[PDB]
Design an enzyme around this catalytic site. Structure first.
Site, short mmCIF file in Angstrom:
data_model
loop_
_atom_site.label_atom_id
_atom_site.label_comp_id
_atom_site.label_asym_id
_atom_site.label_seq_id
_atom_site.Cartn_x
_atom_site.Cartn_y
_atom_site.Cartn_z
N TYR A 28 0.85 -1.26 0.15
CA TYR A 28 -0.05 -0.07 0.21
C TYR A 28 0.89 1.81 0.09
CZ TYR A 28 -4.20 -3.15 0.81
OH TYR A 28 -5.93 -3.21 0.63
N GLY A 30 2.51 3.45 -1.84
CA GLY A 30 2.50 3.97 -3.03
C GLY A 30 1.75 4.13 -3.96
N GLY A 32 0.23 0.94 -5.88
CA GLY A 32 -1.52 0.27 -5.90
C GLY A 32 -2.03 -0.08 -4.56
N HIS A 48 -4.27 5.89 5.18
CA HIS A 48 -4.41 6.93 4.49
C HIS A 48 -4.76 6.87 2.76
CE1 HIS A 48 -2.21 10.18 2.33
NE2 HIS A 48 -2.17 10.78 2.95
N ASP A 49 -4.87 6.08 2.49
CA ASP A 49 -5.84 5.64 0.87
C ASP A 49 -7.16 5.48 1.30
OD1 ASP A 49 -3.14 4.92 -0.46
OD2 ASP A 49 -4.05 3.25 -0.61
N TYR A 52 -7.77 9.28 1.99
CA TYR A 52 -7.64 10.36 0.79
C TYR A 52 -9.30 9.72 0.10
CZ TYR A 52 -3.68 12.74 0.38
OH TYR A 52 -2.50 13.55 0.28
N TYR A 67 -2.52 24.01 2.52
CA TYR A 67 -3.35 23.69 3.33
C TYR A 67 -2.43 24.74 4.51
CZ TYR A 67 -1.00 18.74 4.31
OH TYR A 67 -0.82 18.39 4.11
N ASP A 93 -3.61 13.07 6.00
CA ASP A 93 -1.38 13.92 5.90
C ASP A 93 -0.96 13.31 6.89
OD1 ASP A 93 -1.98 13.66 2.96
OD2 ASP A 93 -1.27 15.93 2.77
#
Length: 119
Positions: A28, A30, A32, A48-49, A52, A67, A93
């Protein structure tokens, strides 16, 4: 996304390692996003994915501007309140920048065979 995320990572980890070390790690960290996270740093990237994907379903991408954040002794923290989408992406983030700084970096998990380990 990436410029400001890199400043938060460098703030939280104090410069321990360059941001690019986290860009091709596990399943995860990177491009993909398949399989089970290989360790606790990889689980940081999966959360984090998820974060987002939620921001995109709330219309927060592309980013309106930069931000607001501050790198204190404490480490990084987000400062937007009234601009809600900028605060939401910064929260994603900075939670990953702290998670990264606290996770062990397993060098055997850098640049793995992702078609095999995550699939």
């Amino acid at each position: 996304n990436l410029v400001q995320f890199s400043y938060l990572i460098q703030c939280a980890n104090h410069g321990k390692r360059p941001t690019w070390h986290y860009m091709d790690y596990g399943c995860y960290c990177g491009a993909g996003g398949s399989g089970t996270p290989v360790d606790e740093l990889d689980r940081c990237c999966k959360i984090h994915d998820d974060c987002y994907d939620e921001a995109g379903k709330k219309g927060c991408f592309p980013k309106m501007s930069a931000y607001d954040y501050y790198c204190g002794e404490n480490g990084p923290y987000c400062r937007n309140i009234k601009k809600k989408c900028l605060r939401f992406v910064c929260d994603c983030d900075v939670e990953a920048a702290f998670c990264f700084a606290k996770a062990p970096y397993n060098n055997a998990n850098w640049n793995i065979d992702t078609k095999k380990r995550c699939q």
